[model samples]
Target: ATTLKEAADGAGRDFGFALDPNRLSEAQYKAIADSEFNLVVAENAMKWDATEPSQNSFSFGAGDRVASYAADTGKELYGHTLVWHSQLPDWAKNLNGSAFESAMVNHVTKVADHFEGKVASWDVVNAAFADGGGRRQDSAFQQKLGNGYIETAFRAARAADPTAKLCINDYNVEGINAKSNSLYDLVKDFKARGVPLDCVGFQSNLIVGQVPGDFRQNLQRFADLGVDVRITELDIRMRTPSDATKLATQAADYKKVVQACMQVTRCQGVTVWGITDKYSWVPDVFPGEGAALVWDASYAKKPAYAAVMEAF
Candidate 1:
């Protein structure tokens, strides 16, 4: 297959990228997005801040544009997030007690309902756990609604859209460790209690040559819990002024991630964080680190692109 979507289709998977609505105006950007990927997730369009800026008043302008593009291109749409600690508006952050809980449920329900049949899945709650372990104490929902907020959000999303798969997404849980262990325990308990969870999203944002050795094993364990596993928001970053040597290593890293997902039965597929290096979030967030995607700044296919095709 000449395209990632074609390759993924042959493997019974959906290859995707996070779509930035503003970039769709660029001819090259839109062409690659429509042709290369079978799935698309809004990068920031569907977040809490973008969707509902105030209580009871909602906005879907940006998100709707991405959704319309997905529909027009016949791509599967994945809702980025319903409940997250970051990118939240002040009104939501200030609420407390039952009011806070009601607001959260309202947000999830309304957003999920709005995109009901269009969105294939949703990150009902994101980054609920800290780096090493334990719940993230800084989240507004955690501060007001406590630990049960995660389950609450999932239930609300499920109720709002029964057809969409509900998922719990988090970062730094790509491998077996304290953080992943905590997530594992939570998934187990949720399964026992029937919390309407369907998948676990491992935001495989890694550094070049740093792909965890036991990444596949960790995914397999989660699949064993009877929930789908996905490598969401994947991007391998490296220092600026990348050389042929680092690019080659990045290719291998990309191949390893795809192969790991392929080996696990319940591992759904992979989605790179962005379509090209020019728009990658690495440089701005990580400072000196850049060159973190399958396509280069000039729209040339990088070695990592070929590596992914080979793996698929």
Candidate 2:
């Protein structure tokens, strides 16, 4: 009962793939459910490739298991990343014209139908369009769904599960700079055009000492657009075998990030990508580094973890 939901509602939050239902054993998941995170961000559970590796063969076994886990402990769940440029099924990439649109609709519909009312929210479209205008080029959806695929995906997802709050989650839009501005412009456009957008996920994978001057302002600007803002994938990192100063700096960054979110009116949540620093996928994916998270490999709360909770 000490889950993050224990302290607050959707505004204060937690997230991690350090606990994946597909990979965890019974005891592990039982512990996950009982942990201090009420709002669960189901990692890779909704990815196009993870759930449906083949064209005609869609599998929800892993995702279903996750939903079941969350239901058991009464944890609110947010299904991650329905559509993206990465990790898409090969068949979807090849489809064109009307076939592509049907495929997209079915993909969203079936996925939504699978979870239904269980999902508190859904990243209906993740990193689909560029930080600037126009749709993302070279992705499967872009090739088929074309320029307006972002809106199309949103509409299709809404048709399938109107209950789930639809969000656009992505990195590179953290600071109040050009990339973030571009995202804001698109959000404004979506709001003006009525694209069914309910939330904007600001993925803040920060470096230990790279905290920006306008960090809070960045979050406030997005919230000012009338959409819920969330610190989706927070992890401040340093090189391998962290030092005292680095750890302290990361903790400072963590507190600052959470404080920024807390200050933003519509900024309703914060989700760390992984539970432990060692389990963070950043080092492996980014190469020759180690920094991005609040817990150590032993599952002990790091200074940043304490700092984040303090911020909450």
Candidate 3:
């Protein structure tokens, strides 16, 4: 397998990978540490339940290893999300209205405060937008603090880690669709209000044969909106493994994704979801789909990885 370190030396922001807790072996870890990539995004750094299973009691031991490893390797680190409705404790799920915001604010303060500026970026308010408009329907945050809670989270993140780049990140936003537009509008509102936002992350989890025809144009549109943009979770999937034609198609999509970034001045970087397609969480999460990564199972390099390297 060609390590990320091999490709990160160029002028391009290069690429990084999300490392799930306990998934990497010692050899793989060393390989990544020695690679060209200097950035690492922690898979689940501060989920409310993960950090504080109970109120006021935080256990950072789990995420601390990843954070320390990133720091030790001199890699820029990022957290999976600061605010998301998923992977939270059931007790937190029921609290809506004012009570929920109070609890949320407390929790956010604790996690971000724990690592402070060690994380270069944070998905401060993740998946907090709906397809059609401002507040996401399923988010507990919206149920409690309404759509405006994003600002509250950002401000609190600043208080926790002033040096960290607070981000608003989500999926299905490769192009300028209704979902991405709504997020941009929210970002505009946040910027106008002087929110402590540092960047915007696009979860470029594209499926094979589904590349947005106008990928660069859409990215440029968002970049012109005045915030740094990056393909945070980029991975193009084929229906199955080892199909030469589909792999070629996936490579085309990878080139488009990188080209989109290349066309946008503020599009600073691109990070693949994980090290390989064998460990991709998307297929199980949205079953019947797999082989969506730059590397195949045995750590062999895939065409998509080359496409990205060639882009640089």
Off by over 4 Å in 2: 1-18, 26-33, 131-135
| Cα lDDT, all candidates | 0.93, 0.75, 0.77
RMSD of each: 0.8, 2.5, 2.1
When sorted by lDDT, best at the front, the candidate numbers are 1, 3, 2
TM-score, ranked from best to worst: 1, 3, 2
lDDT of 2 by residue, 133-191 (tens): 44566677777666677888889888989788888887777887666776788789999
Better of 1 and 2 by TM-score: 1
By TM-score, who's the top model here?
1
Local accuracy of candidate 3 as per-residue lDDT tens digits, 48-149: 677878666778987898888787877778887778877777777778777778878888888888888787888888888777655688877777677678
Candidate 1 weakest ten by summed lDDT: 137-146
* Winning candidate number (lDDT): 1
Tell me the deviation in Å of residue 194 in model 3.
1.1
Candidate 2 CA-lDDT value: 0.75
Between prediction 2 and prediction 3, the one with superior lDDT is 3
